[PDB]
Amino acid sequence: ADAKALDELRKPKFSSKYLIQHVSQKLIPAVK
Amino acid sequence: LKLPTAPLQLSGTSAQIATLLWQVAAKENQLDKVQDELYQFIELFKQHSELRRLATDPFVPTLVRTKIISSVLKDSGASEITKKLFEALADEGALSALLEVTVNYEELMLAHKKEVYCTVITAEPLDKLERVELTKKAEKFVDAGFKLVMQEKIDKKLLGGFVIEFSDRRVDMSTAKKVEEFNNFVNKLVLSI
Amino acid sequence: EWEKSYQPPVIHLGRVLSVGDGIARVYGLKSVQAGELVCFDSGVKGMALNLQADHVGVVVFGNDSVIHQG
Amino acid sequence: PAIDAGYVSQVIGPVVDVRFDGELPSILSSLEVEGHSVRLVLEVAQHMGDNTVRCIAMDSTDGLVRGQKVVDTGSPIKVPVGRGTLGRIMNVIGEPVDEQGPIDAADIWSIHREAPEFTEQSTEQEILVTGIKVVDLLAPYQRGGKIGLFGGAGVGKTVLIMELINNVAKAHGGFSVFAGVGERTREGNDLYREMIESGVIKLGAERGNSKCTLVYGQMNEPPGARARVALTGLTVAEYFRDIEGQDVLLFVDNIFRFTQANSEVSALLGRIPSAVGYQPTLATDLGGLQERITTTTKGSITSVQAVYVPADDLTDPAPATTFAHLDATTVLSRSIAELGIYPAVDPLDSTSRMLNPNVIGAEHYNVARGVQKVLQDYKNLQDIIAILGMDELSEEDKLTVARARKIQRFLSQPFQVAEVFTGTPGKYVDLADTISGFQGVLTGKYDDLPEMAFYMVGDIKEVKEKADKMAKDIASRKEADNKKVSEELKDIPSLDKLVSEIKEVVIEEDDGLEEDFKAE
Numbered sequence A: 001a002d003a004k005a006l007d008e009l010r011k012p013k014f015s016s017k018y019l020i021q022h023v024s025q026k027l028i029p030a031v032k
Numbered sequence B: 001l002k003l004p005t006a007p008l009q010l011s012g013t014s015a016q017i018a019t020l021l022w023q024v025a026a027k028e029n030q031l032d033k034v035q036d037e038l039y040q041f042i043e044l045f046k047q048h049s050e051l052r053r054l055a056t057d058p059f060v061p062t063l064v065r066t067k068i069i070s071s072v073l074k075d076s077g078a079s080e081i082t083k084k085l086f087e088a089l090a091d092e093g094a095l096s097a098l099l100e101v102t103v104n105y106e107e108l109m110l111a112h113k114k115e116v117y118c119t120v121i122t123a124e125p126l127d128k129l130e131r132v133e134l135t136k137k138a139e140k141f142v143d144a145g146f147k148l149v150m151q152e153k154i155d156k157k158l159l160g161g162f163v164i165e166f167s168d169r170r171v172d173m174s175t176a177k178k179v180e181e182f183n184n185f186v187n188k189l190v191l192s193i
Numbered sequence C: 001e002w003e004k005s006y007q008p009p010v011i012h013l014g015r016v017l018s019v020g021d022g023i024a025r026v027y028g029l030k031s032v033q034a035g036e037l038v039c040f041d042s043g044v045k046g047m048a049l050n051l052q053a054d055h056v057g058v059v060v061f062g063n064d065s066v067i068h069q070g
Numbered sequence D: 001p002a003i004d005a006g007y008v009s010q011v012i013g014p015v016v017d018v019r020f021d022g023e024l025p026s027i028l029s030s031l032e033v034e035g036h037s038v039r040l041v042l043e044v045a046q047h048m049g050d051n052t053v054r055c056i057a058m059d060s061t062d063g064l065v066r067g068q069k070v071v072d073t074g075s076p077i078k079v080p081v082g083r084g085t086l087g088r089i090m091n092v093i094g095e096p097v098d099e100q101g102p103i104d105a106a107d108i109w110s111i112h113r114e115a116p117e118f119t120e121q122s123t124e125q126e127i128l129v130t131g132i133k134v135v136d137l138l139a140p141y142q143r144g145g146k147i148g149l150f151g152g153a154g155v156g157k158t159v160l161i162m163e164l165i166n167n168v169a170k171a172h173g174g175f176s177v178f179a180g181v182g183e184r185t186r187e188g189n190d191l192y193r194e195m196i197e198s199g200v201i202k203l204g205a206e207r208g209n210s211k212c213t214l215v216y217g218q219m220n221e222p223p224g225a226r227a228r229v230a231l232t233g234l235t236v237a238e239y240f241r242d243i244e245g246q247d248v249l250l251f252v253d254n255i256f257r258f259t260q261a262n263s264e265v266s267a268l269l270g271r272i273p274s275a276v277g278y279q280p281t282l283a284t285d286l287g288g289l290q291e292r293i294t295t296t297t298k299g300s301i302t303s304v305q306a307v308y309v310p311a312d313d314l315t316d317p318a319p320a321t322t323f324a325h326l327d328a329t330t331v332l333s334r335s336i337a338e339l340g341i342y343p344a345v346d347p348l349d350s351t352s353r354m355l356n357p358n359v360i361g362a363e364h365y366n367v368a369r370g371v372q373k374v375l376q377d378y379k380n381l382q383d384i385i386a387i388l389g390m391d392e393l394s395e396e397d398k399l400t401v402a403r404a405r406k407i408q409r410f411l412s413q414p415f416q417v418a419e420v421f422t423g424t425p426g427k428y429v430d431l432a433d434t435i436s437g438f439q440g441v442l443t444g445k446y447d448d449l450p451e452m453a454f455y456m457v458g459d460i461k462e463v464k465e466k467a468d469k470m471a472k473d474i475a476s477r478k479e480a481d482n483k484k485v486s487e488e489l490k491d492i493p494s495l496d497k498l499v500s501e502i503k504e505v506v507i508e509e510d511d512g513l514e515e516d517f518k519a520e
């Protein structure tokens, strides 16, 4: 699925950062 | 060949990917690792524009999208499950289905973690004897041995009491609806008696 | 006697996805029966006609101009 | 019991989807629903591809929740067949609905089976005399063939099939099976009482001496049940043909209801519709039924299948597909039923493969072809009689008009079962007598007889007898009408003496409706 269980992903809920930290520096030469 | 059964059945074509993902990560017992990885990918889609351009643009070729999702997910300790999932979902342009495959995966894991949510909405901040007496009356609405959590919201429209929001059933034990059903019960008798 | 016998019952509710052309695509209602008389919040009744896998089709016994999404 | 216990996924009317975790059933197999009010039997029609079958429900789906467990039987819908079913009424799943205990079952046969092959077919042509004049004259019924009674909505194809039951089904020697596919429930109760009163159905412990098995899925049943009751009647008849090895009868009422039930189901399976609104698989479903009703080498099934036409339309595809599967066709028309003719057999559209000069004789064949020729030359002149009148025709044409008006009235016949509402007693005509009668009217031996003497009489004696009766009563006259009504000696009492004889009923205080509503 509904909208009520899909709006609640707009708030951050990872509780770990081992993916969004490293690949944020890799993505820009990958699209370059 | 031998896949463990999902705790609750679900819908098609986006919930089936979540069913297969829960089955595979339950064969590997990484059921909370890949949930964290999918949450990280949701926020990663939120952060940058060159990644959501891989899911909303229809003029990106599938070769560069497959090679970008492989060469990005080569490293950083990513699971084999999430890597092969994103490879298969980027080969077919199904990266926009991430936001509604992870919700069905969360419903599946919430069925497994044996934990059901609720939300009690009130008028005053609850005190500790109000709360421990609330849990005994709200547990009688669950149907097995679960871990029903109790969320708190405050809304001044109720004149005391509590309303339980289970996201599928609603128990209105409030006084504002008690007096609302009271004034409806009188006026059906004054017109008659 | 109405207060000493007053238990507010648990009610399984569901949202409305879309309304138009004499149907109400109702989200949820996992415990509804095919042909069960459902009752909207505006008072107008309905019948759970098409129990689909992802919603419940509800025809509206009355004017559907009082029914919104949500 | 985690595996082999599926749950209901979705419900669209009479179409139920079951989703399994493993070992989906084969198509055309029967499922059982756990915790339903009646025993609701599903039947798998498709595989939807997400571990999901798409079932047709043999009862109502009102009250199905999308969490109900559904077990598998691992078999199709299997009905109790044997000699013990003789005298029982069965629904589409083989239960007795006549309340006489369970069915004494020799074997339990499924309703889905392959048709008998090409080498098992029999090629035999012997006549079946029915006593009706139009059937035994213009389209003689094959003994062991297929018979379709077309025509729709009040032309008399359900009266005609009761007349065929009453004529052939008692002088046959073999068994009979009546399969009521979507006709009235009242008609099934009428046939049940009329077969108990006639002795082809017996009750008690002497049930086995009966000669008729009833299978009813009548028109109150949901479209899952009406699509399968013809197959159940076929399984009951095919046990007698295939295992008992003896010749039966199989009167299927309203075989259009089979095609219509499959069209009501196939609207909700999401298939693209064919011509005027039917399913795409009309011809194959009707072939897979109708090719099972065949006479093999070991036995015979002589079927009389009433075929309802929609809105009197023979170019509708549901009867026009059925026209190819029938040996002898008996088309009924409403334009002849509005002329008072009964049975309203259309003589220039009802054909048979038995009408051949090598089989039934050149005398019967030439009489039938002459009758068809006279009626067709009459039908060519109908507009000329309409606008220009009878007073300008040729001599030969206004002789063929009189001969055709005599044979149209002569083809009508009072029925042995229709006298409940018409008064005229029914006349069972022999074959050679009606052949000789139509030979006489074709040659012209009865030109000077009145036309209404031919109406509603059995054979060539009774037309001259009705001419003598109806041409007495135009010249019959009595003088003073011989009343002797007044002054009857100790016969008529007074009016108040007859009033005092009447017992008086009491009036029980204004409908008593509250006393027998607070009782429950």
Ligand SMILES: Nc1ncnc2c1ncn2[C@@H]1O[C@H](COP(=O)(O)OP(=O)(O)O)[C@@H](O)[C@H]1O
Binding pocket: D151, D152, D153, D154, D155, D156, D157, D158, D159, D160, D342, D343, D413, D414, D415, D418, D421, D422
């Ligand atoms: N041989 C007949 N003689 C007189 N009336 C008939 C005859 N056959 C049929 N009818 C009339 O047709 C009516 C019923 O037709 P029916 O057999 O029910 O056709 P259908 O089943 O298509 O409606 C009866 O009320 C009856 O009056």
Ligand SMILES: [Mg+2]
Binding pocket: D157, D158, D159, D183, D184, D187
């Ligand atoms: Mg009828």
